[PDB]
């Protein structure tokens, strides 16, 4: 899963 958050 490609980082989202930021």
């Amino acid at each position: 899963p490609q980082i989202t958050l930021w």
């Epitope: 899963p1 490609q2 980082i3 989202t4 958050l5 930021w6």
Partner: single-chain antibody, 232 residues
Framework: DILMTQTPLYLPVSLGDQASISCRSS???????????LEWYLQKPGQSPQLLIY???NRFSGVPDRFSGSGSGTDFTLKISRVEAEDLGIYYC?????????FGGGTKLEIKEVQLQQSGPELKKPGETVKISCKAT????????MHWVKQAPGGDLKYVGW????????TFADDFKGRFAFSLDTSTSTAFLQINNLKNEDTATYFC?????????????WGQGTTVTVSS
């Protein structure tokens, strides 16, 4: 942006004592999703950080209950009920709640299947170029992203940025916009970091890191790191 201040700089104990390390953040660190990404790392000489506590009070797999995290607001504390020999090293607190993620200055506790392979050390002269490599193994390279943390000669940790392993799209923290570039070879499941027009300030160990955010953990897998020595 968000400054993480640790207390104390040094912590001398005797095998068996209780240890407490605090960390204050210049701002609230509650990600908009309702999660507070405060995390505690233990780093031993020559190695890379080891995620211990994440989401303030959560112990990472393998971490013994002698370790416990607490706090709220801006002050956070890491407690070690009884210090053991293997606990010796530098403890770093860190927040991944707001970009760019940031690390505390570290506290040196002292006495009175997934793997990432990084290329070897580089000795360069100011002005040259370097392309450090990081080969991901035992996980779908394109599933997660690849992060890059810089560790200065002093020990300081800085987020360089990350790259979408699916879109080949990089994102950098402001202090790495300019001369840093991310790339990849999904063919060989490898992430690259290239620094152009090197400067003494670039001398540091760079680690590629893999997160596990869907699990709430940030930076759970680190490469051994690569040392770039920019000597004049």
């Amino acid at each position: 942006d968000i400054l993480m201040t640790q207390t104390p700089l040094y912590l001398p104990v005797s095998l068996g004592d209780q240890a407490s390390i605090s960390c204050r953040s210049s701002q609230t660190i509650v990600h908009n999703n309702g999660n507070t990404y405060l995390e505690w790392y233990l780093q031993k000489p020559g190695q890379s950080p080891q995620l211990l506590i994440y989401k303030v009070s959560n112990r990472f797999s393998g971490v013994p209950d002698r370790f416990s995290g607490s706090g709220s607001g801006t002050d956070f504390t890491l407690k070690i009920s009884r210090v053991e020999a293997e606990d010796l090293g530098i403890y770093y607190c860190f927040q991944g709640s707001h970009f760019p993620p940031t690390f505390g200055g570290g506290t040196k506790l002292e006495i009175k299947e997934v793997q990432l392979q990084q290329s070897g050390p580089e000795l360069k002269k100011p002005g040259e170029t370097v392309k450090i490599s990081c080969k991901a193994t035992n996980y779908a390279f394109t599933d997660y992203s690849m992060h890059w943390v810089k560790q200065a000669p002093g020990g300081d940790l800085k987020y360089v940025g990350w790259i979408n392993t699916e879109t080949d799209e990089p994102t950098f923290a402001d202090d790495f916009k300019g001369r840093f570039a991310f790339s990849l070879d999904t063919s060989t499941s490898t992430a690259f970091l290239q620094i152009n027009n090197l400067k003494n300030e670039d001398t540091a160990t760079y680690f590629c890191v893999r997160d596990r955010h869907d699990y709430g953990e940030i930076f759970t897998y680190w490469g051994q790191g690569t040392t770039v020595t920019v000597s004049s």
